[PDB]
């Protein structure tokens, strides 16, 4: 029960803030399946920030939960695929931690709409 335009503006800003936390840009684009041929064997739904941007503009995110669900996929897919002693796994933990704070503040602002 809100206006579409300000909500999408908020999701755009939020997505930019989450990308800022991924300083290595390891989640910016889809996991390269040509370099990771076994990736789809374990990961049923790949996700990344570029795909999230396309979904946002395609109106796939009309509430905060669906936006946050795809962010959580970025994190959980990486924790699942990679061993704990890898940079990838630790980067996903760090993104979960730093991204969670970004998301809580942004959801509060959506709730004011
Ligand atoms: C191999 C690999 C594994 C991997 N797991 N999660 C992510 C994100 N990745 C990558 C991202 C960019 C390039 C390679 C990978």
Swiss-Prot record:
Processing after translation: Acetylated by KAT6A.
Membrane-crossing segments per the record: none
Report the subcellular localization: Nucleus; Chromosome; Cytoplasm
What domain of life does the UniProt record list for this protein's source?
Eukaryota
Q: In which tissues is it expressed?
A: High levels in testis.
- Tell me which residues make up the Bromo domain: 2-106
Disorder noted? Intellectual developmental disorder with dysmorphic facies and ptosis: An autosomal dominant neurodevelopmental disorder characterized by delayed psychomotor development, intellectual disability, delayed language, and facial dysmorphisms, most notably ptosis. Additional features may include poor growth, hypotonia, and seizures.
Q: How does it assemble?
A: Component of some HBO1 complex composed of KAT7/HBO1, MEAF6, ING5, and BRPF1. Component of the MOZ/MORF complex composed at least of ING5, KAT6A, KAT6B, MEAF6 and one of BRPF1, BRD1/BRPF2 and BRPF3. Interacts (via PHD-type zinc finger domains) with unmethylated histone H3 at 'Lys-4' (H3K4me0). Interacts with trimethylated 'Lys-36' of histone H3 (H3K36me3). Interacts with ING5; interaction directs BRPF1 to H4K4me3-enriched chromatin at the 5' of active genes. Interacts with KAT7.
User: Its function?
Assistant: Scaffold subunit of various histone acetyltransferase (HAT) complexes, such as the MOZ/MORF and HBO1 complexes, which have a histone H3 acetyltransferase activity. Plays a key role in HBO1 complex by directing KAT7/HBO1 specificity towards histone H3 'Lys-14' acetylation (H3K14ac). Some HAT complexes preferentially mediate histone H3 'Lys-23' (H3K23ac) acetylation. Positively regulates the transcription of RUNX1 and RUNX2.
Q: What is this protein called?
A: Peregrin
What taxonomic lineage is listed for the species of origin?
A: Eukaryota, Metazoa, Chordata, Craniata, Vertebrata
Coverage span on the entire protein: 627 to 739 of 1214
């Amino acid at each position: 029960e809100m206006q579409l335009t300000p909500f999408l503006i908020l999701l755009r800003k939020t997505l930019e803030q989450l990308q800022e936390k991924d300083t290595g840009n390891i989640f910016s684009e889809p996991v390269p399946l040509s370099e990771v041929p076994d990736y789809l064997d374990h990961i049923k739904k790949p996700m990344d920030f570029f795909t999230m941007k396309q979904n946002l503009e395609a109106y796939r995110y009309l509430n905060f939960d669906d936006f946050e669900e795809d962010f959580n996929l970025i994190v959980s897919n990486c924790l699942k695929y990679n061993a704990k002693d890898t940079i990838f796994y630790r980067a996903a933990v760090r993104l979960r931690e730093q991204g969670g704070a970004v998301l809580r503040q942004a959801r509060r602002q959506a709730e004011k709409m």
